[PDB]
Structure 1
Amino acid sequence: GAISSVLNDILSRLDPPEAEVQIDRLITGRLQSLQTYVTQQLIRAAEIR
């Protein structure tokens, strides 16, 4: 949902007033990806166990 996917782009373009609008979209997108992945691992670990 941000203007770019790279963390190094927003740190080189936008101010920390305008980066916290954009980096927190990257953090939420990467945390939900990890909360997707840990969900996919625990269900798979319940299959292996």
Structure 2
Amino acid sequence: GAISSVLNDILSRLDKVEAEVQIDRLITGRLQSLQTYVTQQLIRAAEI
């Protein structure tokens, strides 16, 4: 839901009033991606 995925784009065209919220979404989505990845990896490790 951000204007771009590329974090440098947001930091090239938005300032602290706007860049901050745009980054937050990407933090919320990427942190969830890591959470999902580790969750699968812990479930696979239990099988291995």
Same fold (TM over 0.5): yes
Moved over 2 A (4+): none
- The CA deviation at 1:40 is 1.0
Unaligned runs of 5+ in 2: none
Distance, in Å, in 2 between the alignment partners of 1:40 and 1:15 is: 37
Question: TM-score normalised to the size of structure 1?
Answer: 0.90
Deviations for 1:1-49, whole angstroms, at most 9, x for unmatched residues?
111101111010101110111001111111000001001100111111x
Distance, in Å, in 2 between the alignment partners of 1:8 and 1:47 is: 40
Q: Which residue of 2 aligns with 1:8?
A: 8
Question: TM-score normalised to the size of structure 2?
Answer: 0.91
Answer 1 or 2: which has greater helix percent: 2
Q: Please provide the CA RMSD for this pair.
A: 0.7
Unaligned runs of 5+ in 1: none
Give % identity: 96
